[PDB]
Symmetry: D2
Subunit: 726 residues, 4 copies
């Protein structure tokens, strides 16, 4: 029951493109990729080769195929301790999933700053460009359970644990620069409204349902982040191709005690890219693990996710200089007003070994800050600081969750706390309190200072009465949604209108639809009319006369809010489907593969069955997947080489492959006799921008396809796809 | 008062076809449908209309929109016990999902025998055709988590809790008449092989991956239930149009002490029906809650699932 | 700088006698002591000196005396993550105590066999006299909670974890050779009857209440272990001076497959010794931690607890050769019929570092056996096999309790079990199932064999119907109690009578006392009449005429069942109280102390205040404790040297000290004018056996005292004590 | 949360209020109350916003904190008055 004699059960421990080898635990795939945190986990990594199978008590098992019984057709005996231990462990494998962001995918990596930031912060991890800090990053969706789909429409989480020399800092962010609500007291209300409804627990992974849109229509502070969710920001192509934001204003504190306000940004060095809705929603059915798989495979291929940490910095004296409150998490700080200053680079370069032990059990919490950072009075952040330590008591089984290996600091930690469930650390200190004389008061407090000092909070002045009251400066809800809307390209605006139209069409109670369209009319009448038209609603004269909200500090637009207005494409790590036939023209395939290789773009060779096909020169081509098995949804572009095109010309799946890719605005390239497929997608003889065609694949043909890929999708084709039956 | 003045927020408490009205909790949609178990749950049913919002300690809340802070732009105070109770409760809402059959959809109902079976069993619930036993039934898939999709290819669970006069009897079955393995000692091996692979936790809801088929290839006892999963039995149209089976031979024991071997079956009175694969897989994207929805909406329409 | 300048805060890291230095964590007190399990725990031991105080996330704390507030008299802020982490950990410190045996005290040590037992067992740990196996042993009571007193009347547990090269073997025994009930299905009923009654949760640590005696009176199978409990076996002097037993018949399996029935024994090398009831009960008030303290201090002094493992062996073909069933755990195997064969020695030589992490979290379970052992069908053992795995799921938080450091095997353990709460091990195996090909089926099953083989159960024949039925062979309840009773000395019998009389006087419902007396009449009339007389119950003519049960295989007694019938005293590690005065005769003190030192007997110097006193010749004598502060209960003998006796002659506490020690049968020695204390204990001028007296404290005065100590108590004194008001 | 097993410790009979209690809190380990409210959030329209907030007042009013004035800097410091 054993491995094949040729060793093909085991993936090469070298970088390989997606699909070339089975995926594997990180430490077996990239044994030479190390960092201080990865090394520190060696105490708990367990191998397997050459070891006997045992009980958890170390007793060798002789027969792991049978229960102990009285005769071979008899009853199972209660003294079978080997069966009972194995089945008890199984029966208790599950722990509670995270209340929100339960679906997530994680990896290890490292960060380093470009230059010392000691003038603005005393944080040790930002102090030296050559001091590297290991990180562990989890990306997530928000609403759905741990078993829900990846390419839903949702906000995405982007949480980074930095294992610094002065403590763990967790930067627990999302992929949009604001949140839906202003004060943490409403968090359970908002979450309950977006989550599956309580009677029947439907719908999973979707805000397209009555209670969410009821809450939005009654709480206009949500509209800004709803605009982001309804745009293509809600459906990223990959966690490598989205932005990250800390949302809140925090403080940096330097060694002289000066505070600067800061908001944190991650910029994806692979560029910004998102799916289109029909593609995203179909991909939730064809590969619900699409983002998890793409992240793992990019890392196995060497296409490591890279992101640039950036800070927007506002001096303390400029707190009130904007037309919005800096402490309001439903407001963004436009980059035209305050630029993002580049701070450092993070590279994710190794996958975990075991998803449960590393990803499921990791705990991130934004209250895990270090000296040189501090909080502000943002009322959403303030409440988050309560929740993330509280929730681990049930999720991770008690107060020792920091001794779960992935969560452990790699710097020293010593204190007088003791006991609690599954306590690992055995304290030898004769004292468990301070002040003590019996251990000469160790471990000891440390004064604050420029480096290696104790934490002290910035001594912000507090003046007010004890109130449960929203600041009046937070009571403006329409100007930021409007700025976002005006900053999108025309096709991005069309997709926003489509996202609201789709969602509100699934709200069963029509008055809720009407109320949301009335909110939209307070943002932009063109948006509101376009959504109302799709819903069969007519705006009233009063609604047509609503005065637009003001510009944000004079801005009519900020192009940094668009995914696509400023080119930033990077094709390395993208994937193309190559539709084979049973006699491929090998000179076309040579040229295609050579050009793709030079840009780091991967290929998947598809056919109408699995196994191999032979090219015209005898080259044996292994088939990665069938046309139906790996649909166009899973790739960025489609190329069809010449050869025996009659083999595939009338194959329904191959023709549909091209029609789906066309509808979803992907570049298509057709060589030689593959040009007969132009007829399936109605391309004119003269050609169309976005369809590359020629007698053969060559240098010019591939350069054109690759230029298309750098622009991600063929937006000009949009008016031509409504007629296509696909 | 946020409800529309026309009363359109509230579904009619009468049978209505799918999509005609918003769905509702069963006791609000069908208040006059009763059985002995549903009546016994009255002690714990909590309403809401006309009551004041309170903490869990019964203290009325005045402002459920704001944390307590020192100044309206100031820091939140630790003495805000109303915020901390609400968020504590929220923070501990989740419990572990079931190790298998975590994705399932349930409903209440009742069972009645056609005739007394006292000649073959002394079970009280099968003793008298006029004796009604309340039931609660959960249908499920096997591999995926509680937030996975309904129309995956998988075996389905079909579990029935009979609330009898002589104790709870749970008939915990599936939709095929056999299982993949012979001895319980192998259940964690089989389940680990069909569940998402342990390095990366992929794939959800699918046996279409190397470790499942590795196990199958090495344990030919699995081939019979794999045949059923690969057939259209693995993609039912609805929980109403699949069969149920207890799988195992059990015994019936009569009052004279005679044992008879028995295997349990459920026949769907709606008939048997399945999807085709491309449709099932696509539907897991277009509506991952399709079976849970269809069950709930068939009951709200009066198309009650019936099984013999 | 809080430690005193002279270093007197820190205990000497060397062996010191009880009271000489404060006690300390074991790795600080005895850094040189080691074994393979103590070495394997080093990876989780945490130090303290010279480290900064931090959060659990490694952030250094500047001020650990204050919460963060708005103004120094203002409200505490929610953003104080340092205060909330420290209070959260504190708030979750406690875990469920064990359902039974909650009160217990533990130590590390080692075991070695005297010779290889390969002819009868293939167990690795017994295969080589040079093979040393680390152990961890916890001693306990049964009924009380974790915070109940040590010197209650109760059965004691004696549980040993052997960390062998082939797995953890736990020998989970008690200090009597039988248990109270026959079938595990009754365990919850019996334990609920002995436990505090459910309305008011009284009494703690006591069987002297109506429900316990109700159950006993209705369940005569309990009477054997109840006889042991009522005897002085119920009140051991120390865990060092009690026997241990596995109770059940198990099997040994050799390399040829031959099974031998075995019962396990621990023999205390310090000998057998118990308190008397008034002393035990009073000590629960004056020092409820007396046995935990004695164990810890013995190990700090080098008076290591030592036990000899022994086996009673019966060949398979002798299964039915006795008048009682080998599988009945309410029957003992008399040593007159089946001798105990010495097997090896265990020495406990290191205390834990942290009581919660090592003692509270240790899990012992009798199902934890290794190749070379197996179970039998004893129906009490059979049920135990279920409970000990199950109960850990709530007590220790889940199925990973073997990864808590104290529980971890020191031998390899590898299997396909995964996840669960608190998962520490990070599995790198590509497979989590077997059979697999993708990891070449590792880790792999191992066939049984003579060494290092897989576990296989002995193929015992089973034949019968499925029944809920007690074997008729278990239905005999009185013969083993009568053997025990007849094996006791006359003074032991008196203390048994007094144990039942005291307990039954606390039973409020008189009929239950009557029903218990009726059971005693089926055991021995003399016993029953003597209890009855103390309860004001008169036996009926029918009770006077019950035929005594038969002898057991011809035995009318077995002296191995008595604590005292066969002298086995050792004075090493006992303690004497020396009562000082303000002008002690130094020649007396020098001779006493020299003699006690030579035999390894400790002393405590007592007076009426703390500080020091000065001897007649200028020597300064440090006082350990006051008369009231270290009462006679806590010592084994009392010596009063000469000097200024008038200083203490009319000190009530000093007088009371000697009356208490006299009542409790302890040797008392009086030198010179200290003989004036003869009047307080009503001793005649010619003296009496058990009171040592002379003009000075040598020639033979200390030899006389030491011979009295080797015999433990002065049993001949018992007639005289009733006339002492103490 | 650890001692009594989760956040529904108020449903343990001795801890239950004798007066009404209704809110939008749901689930948690060993949840006894079966809520029938169509809504588990507020503000909601689908249950006309019930159960509803109550302004503070002389009797049967909602809880409001006394509006004590707070003036100071954020500090970890013992008042000198306590020394
Ligand atoms: C700016 C607004 C917020 C952002 C950007 C945010 C971000 C996130 C992210 C990314 C995660 C997933 C981390 C992971 O991968 O494990 C998470 C989890 C969580 N958040 Fe937030 N969050 C926000 C607001 C809140 C609020 C207002 C609360 C409640 C007071 C809250 C409580 C929680 C809890 C209980 C978890 C699960 C934590 C765990 O079990 O480890 N969050 N949040
Ligand atoms: C005849 C083969 C089997 C059938 C028909 C079957 C059926 C089911 C069903 C339908 C459920 C879901 C119950 C629900 O809806 O709540 C379930 C749950 C479960 N089963 Fe099985 N099962 C089989 C084999 C096994 C085996 C071999 C084991 C382990 C020894 C096992 C252990 C479990 C466990 C731990 C659960 C979760 C139950 C809970 O959390 O309450 N099952 N089973
Ligand atoms: C000969 C009869 C028995 C003997 C000699 C015995 C011995 C012991 C001892 C010495 C302990 C304390 C172990 C420690 O220090 O952690 C213990 C604990 C325990 N025993 Fe027994 N026992 C007996 C019968 C039973 C039975 C019949 C059951 C139930 C079927 C049971 C269930 C337990 C449980 C639940 C614990 C606490 C274990 C833990 O929490 O880890 N025992 N037993």
């Amino acid at each position: 029951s054993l491995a094949p004699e040729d060793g093909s059960h085991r993936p090469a421990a070298e970088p390989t493109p997606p699909g070339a080898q089975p995926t594997a635990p990180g430490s077996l795939k990239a044994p030479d990729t190390r960092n201080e945190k990865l090394n520190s986990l060696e105490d708990v990594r367990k191998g397997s080769e050459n070891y006997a199978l045992t009980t958890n008590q170390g007793v060798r098992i002789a027969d792991d195929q049978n229960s102990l019984r009285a005769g071979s057709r008899g009853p199972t005996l209660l003294e079978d301790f080997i069966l009972r231990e194995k089945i008890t462990h199984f029966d208790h494998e599950r722990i509670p999933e995270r209340i929100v962001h339960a679906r997530g995918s994680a990896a290890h990596g490292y960060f380093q700053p470009y230059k010392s930031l000691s003038d603005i912060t005393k944080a040790d991890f930002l102090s030296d460009p050559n001091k590297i800090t290991p990180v562990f990053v989890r990306f997530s969706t928000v609403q759905g359970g741990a078993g829900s789909a990846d390419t839903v429409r949702d906000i995405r989480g982007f949480a980074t644990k930095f294992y610094t020399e002065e403590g763990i800092f967790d930067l627990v962010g999302n992929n949009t620069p604001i949140f839906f609500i202003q004060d943490a007291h409403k968090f359970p209300d908002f979450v309950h409204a977006v989550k599956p409804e309580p009677h029947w627990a439907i719908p999973q992974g979707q805000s397209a349902h009555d209670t969410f849109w009821d809450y939005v229509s009654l709480q206009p502070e949500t509209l800004h982040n709803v605009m982001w969710a309804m745009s293509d920001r809600g459906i990223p192509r990959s966690y490598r191709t989205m932005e990250g934001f800390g949302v809140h204003t925090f403080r940096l504190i330097n060694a002289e005690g000066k505070a600067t306000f800061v908001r944190f940004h991650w910029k994806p060095l692979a560029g910004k890219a998102s799916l289109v809705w029909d593609e995203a929603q179909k991909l939730t059915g064809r590969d619900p693990d699409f983002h998890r798989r793409e992240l793992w495979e990019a890392i196995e291929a060497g296409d490591f996710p890279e992101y640039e940490l950036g800070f927007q910095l506002i001096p303390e004296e400029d707190e009130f200089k904007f037309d919005f409150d800096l402490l309001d998490p439903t407001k963004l700080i436009p980059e035209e007003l305050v630029p993002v200053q580049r701070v450092g680079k993070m590279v994710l370069n190794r996958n975990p070994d075991n998803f449960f032990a590393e990803n499921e059990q990791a705990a991130f919490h934004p209250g895990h800050i270090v000296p040189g950072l501090d909080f502000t009075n943002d009322p959403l952040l303030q409440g988050r600081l309560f929740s993330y330590t509280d929730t681990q008591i049930s999720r991770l089984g008690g107060p020792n969750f920091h001794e779960i290996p992935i969560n452990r600091p790699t710097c020293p930690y010593h204190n007088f706390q003791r006991d609690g469930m599954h306590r690992m650390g055995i304290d030898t200190n004769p004292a468990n309190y301070e002040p003590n004389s019996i251990n000469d008061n160790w471990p000891r407090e440390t004064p604050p200072g420029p480096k290696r000092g104790g934490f002290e909070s910035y001594q912000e002045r507090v003046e007010g009465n004890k109130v449960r009251e929203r600041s009046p400066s937070f009571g403006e809800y329409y100007s930021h949604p409007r700025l976002f809307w005006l900053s999108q390209t025309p096709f991005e605006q069309r997709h926003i209108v489509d996202g609201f139209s789709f969602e509100l069409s699934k709200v069963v109670r029509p008055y809720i639809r009407e109320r949301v369209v009335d909110q939209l009319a307070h943002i932009d009448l063109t948006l509101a009319q376009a959504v109302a038209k799709n819903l069969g609603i007519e705006l009233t004269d009063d609604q047509l006369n609503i005065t637009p909200p003001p510009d944000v500090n004079g801005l009519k637009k900020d192009p940094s809010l668009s995914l696509y207005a400023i080119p930033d494409g990077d094709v390395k790590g993208r994937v193309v489907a190559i539709l084979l036939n049973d006699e491929v023209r090998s000179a076309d395939l040579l040229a295609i593969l050579k050009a793709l290789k030079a840009k780091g773009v991967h290929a998947k060779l598809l056919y109408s069955r699995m196994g191999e096909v032979t090219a015209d020169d005898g080259t044996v081509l292994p088939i990665a997947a069938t046309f139906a098995g790996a649909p166009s949804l899973t790739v960025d572009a489609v190329i069809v080489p010449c050869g025996n095109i009659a083999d595939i010309a009338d194959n329904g799946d191959a023709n549909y492959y091209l029609m789906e890719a066309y509808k979803h605005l992907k570049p298509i390239a057709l060589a030689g006799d593959a040009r007969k497929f132009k007829a399936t997608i109605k391309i004119a003889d003269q050609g169309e921008e976005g369809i590359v065609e020629a007698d053969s694949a060559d240098g010019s043909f591939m350069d054109e396809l690759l230029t298309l890929m750098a622009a991600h999708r063929v937006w000009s084709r949009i008016p031509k796809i409504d007629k296509i039956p696909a």
